Point group: C4
């Protein structure tokens, strides 16, 4: 009677299984793909949020091997100048760089009509990848905007999202995206779920999206619901090529905002706890992933993504 | 050995699945049905509780497109005068009105013998729909009272309830109701469950009742267990044509009770927190439903009710 | 690989289903059986605990229609004198009485060798039913003591317990008991479970025991894990003819202990909160059961026990 | 789509089933095996942690019938002198002793290359069993070190670990271990799970490892996730021959550290609550196991391990 498509799993419903291994944490290879034609050295990209990514964080992340997405809450000119500032930026052996030896950078735009001028300025400033972000990637208007952008820029790497289903992933692929970003109500008690009743637990969302996207060689980016480094491992093993994070980098030295002192503690203000330099965070998070790769015998990210197994666990 | 009819699901066991959509939140159509012959403009009706619905709230809700049920804890004459006050009440484009251009209103009576005089006064005051409320709609005495009322008023829209099963819905339909109200121990830790051991999780209760009621074109009204706007969406997708709420409207300006100040805060007394004007509540709750309809591609309430899908989730 | 006999359910895993009913709470018939040859007027008996049952509580409970089990932590002579005091005790239309018009009473003894003198004094004082209590009714020594007692007193009603399985119920029946008492680690976080790892969720324990005991006409008594009146209903619907309670009656006026005042509140000391007269407790607990019987259409206890249905629910 | 090997159970998902019994708690036989050729009198061994086991605790545990593993965080000479101190140590009828009448003792070493000198000193000091401990027993380097040690000391009892799967147990057996130690992310919220995403609920881990190890006569030692004595019972019934504990013995008189007074309480410092003498702990924990053996009719540890049954329970 009730129309239940299936049962859906989140991070806490599963654990990775240890396996025969010739991989040590320090020999694990963290390289992977953001898009069809863009390699990463670590599987982390930063969210296009105005408390997370401007040029300075985008530089610092690229130097550690990820890519940052410059946020769209600023003028066209400011957004293009920040993209440009990352591309011309000149001890960092894992730096994520293009074919021309420049730090990679991404930038976000909205899916509403009228963003053409912004896209054009971003591409002319040398952006490596354009993110069309939306709260509903399976919306026809979003699909339409992606197709228009792919036609106007046939060689531009474009990430479209967010979706949480096989059919949503396929629609984005058919609209021309270079990667599928996944996450609709991915957090266990998030606003979307509470307010709308809509959501898909993220391990199932990633796997369903990856099952389609794998057949085209198109990466899936996991966006949301990550609380601990162990969730990164799980998101990859479910099918994701990398993870997007936001609040985890908000509050770092390199993130926007000014440090202020308030009641004997340090916050960033525009208030979020001060987290020190981005790279210490990356080191701790990637130190968990590397241990997982040791325990699972995953030499490469792709081995974790396509071969590692899970067990299903109870609440207890 | 144990006589278990089936497993039963509540709101928290499920989430709605996002889908291809050409619907924006602001173009979603919230119209639906309360009864077989009564249309609503929004899918909300108010409970016949003495802290929730008298004429003033019933007017204000009807103006926003719902219908209120005037409570029976007052004299026959007072109840009829309040029905009349709504019907003659004269900027509200979504107002819920009858064929004669008057605001719709409902009124409740009990299912005990001896309520004949009350029903007669309510029908003569112009009531649009009579609610026979009971804590057990599958009780023979309730079925009998409904059949007596249907025979005495063959064209009166009558809501009977509450039931929580297919067979209870069918019994009410066979007794002559125009809509089936659903909810027996619908709340996760309610008094009925704790004290009696009886209850049916509401998503399953709605679906089982709707599976019968759909075959007769008879709407199901979901009554109880709603905590957030996202639960409204889920109740509709499970089969309900609209939701009845109570405590959510108690404490509004338009609800009964006098505002009083107590320890620097505003309460309503007859003590419940003051919630401001009813319409702000409706706007927030229907703003969640409209977002859900966007995310699910549901152009109309009936699309959400009959086509949207769920996923089943764990506790974790 | 793991030797799992089955999944087992507790009270919180299930709810009773409402059904067509011609039963009102006040016409529900609460009569039932304690043992094969002893009728009760309500389905409650009191535990043989020294904070719960001596003669005074046993009198008061019998007057309301249950039976109390006088505890064994006192001399033979004192125990026999308390049994006698109940039997000769002379406005209580539901009183539980024997064939001779005397209030019924039970009494407990241990299952160790050497209790013969105690049993003999109790039977000579007129006890209606002997409870051989043990923490493991499937222990051979307990079975042996029951068989010895049945042989020495072929017409004495004997309750043996506790068991939590079909095979344990059958063993007790084959040893000669007149009723099977059920409950091994029945509480969700009890000492037995934590300390020993052993336990059986009580709804499954009752049902498994009843599935055997029904075939011999032998009642099952549910002992433990009851927190609310709704659990009484569930225990009966799972197969139990009545429930034994303990802490629920401890602290009543009629229970042992002296009332004392401590920090502006009343306790019973030998410290447990003062609960007033036993009969108010019985009235509230049986008021829940009667509502359940109305909602389920159960005219009699046996209808609830053998026909009412459950639904299985999640944690959420 | 998602690669889920199976569902996995932890201690809280299961309970032991009571059964016909001729065993009393005081007649239960607690003997078992640590390794293929080493008997224990109780099923407890202590962890090779520097807050848990040095010579003094190892002596005291051996006297109660277990075996302690002297930790490796000290010089070769100190470790060998502590092994020797236990072997020459001279009212304890359950003492665990070798063929020569000396208290048994174990000692740990790491799995890195270069521990040869340490192993040699430990074997020459008379160690009964060598533990090669690792956080990943299915790592090739660990398997290789075990095989090298087995070849150099063909008659030395060697415990290898930790694994959490059938295949990991088989690999360790094929590398030459005398017992398999089990536990990879065995605790419900441990660091390994949170940080790496890897883990196997312990009841399933034990059973899977035992299903392989039983076919070779090789014992499984359960290491981690034990909170209460009831978990010991469950770990044995899942397949384990004994349990290793750590924090449970930390803080005992006999464990390392000096007692200090801090804010009116006693702690051990190197800060952990003071627990008194080891033997009181053993008595309480083995008193739970003995009650379980009574309730399950398990005369011996091997009966609990190979015949006792479980039920599966919900969260509720």
């Amino acid at each position: 009677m009730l129309r239940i498509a299936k049962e859906a799993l989140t991070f806490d419903d599963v654990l990775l299984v240890p396996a025969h291994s010739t991989v040590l944490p320090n020999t694990a290879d963290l390289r992977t793909r953001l898009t069809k034609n863009i390699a990463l050295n670590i599987p982390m990209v930063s969210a296009s949020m105005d408390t997370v990514t401007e040029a300075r964080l985008a530089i610092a992340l690229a130097q550690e091997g990820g890519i940052g997405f410059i946020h769209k809450n600023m003028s066209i000119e400011q957004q293009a100048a920040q993209v440009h500032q990352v591309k011309i930026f000149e001890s960092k052996p894992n730096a994520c760089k293009d074919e021309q030896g420049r730090l990679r950078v991404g930038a976000a735009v909205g899916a509403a009509p009228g963003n053409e001028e912004r896209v054009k300025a971003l591409v002319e400033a040398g952006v490596d990848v354009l993110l069309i972000d939306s709260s509903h990637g399976h919306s026809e208007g979003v699909l339409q905007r992606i197709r228009e952008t792919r036609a106007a820029y046939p060689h531009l790497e474009i990430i479209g999202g967010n979706v949480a289903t096989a059919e949503g992933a396929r629609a984005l692929i058919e609209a021309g995206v270079s990667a599928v970003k996944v996450g609709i109500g991915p957090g266990s008690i998030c606003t979307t779920r509470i307010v709308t009743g809509v959501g898909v637990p993220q391990i199932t969302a990633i796997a369903d999206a990856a099952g389609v996207a794998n057949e085209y060689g198109i990466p899936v980016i996991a966006d949301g619901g990550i609380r601990f480094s162990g969730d990164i491992s799980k998101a990859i093993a479910a099918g994701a090529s990398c993870v997007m994070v936001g609040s985890m980098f908000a509050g770092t030295e390199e993130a926007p905002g000014e440090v202020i002192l308030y009641q004997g503690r340090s916050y960033k203000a525009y208030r979020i706890a001060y987290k020190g330099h981005l790279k210490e965070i990356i080191h701790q998070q990637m130190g968990g992933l590397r241990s997982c790769m040791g325990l699972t015998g995953s030499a490469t990210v792709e081995d974790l993504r396509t071969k590692a197994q899970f067990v299903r666990i109870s609440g207890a």
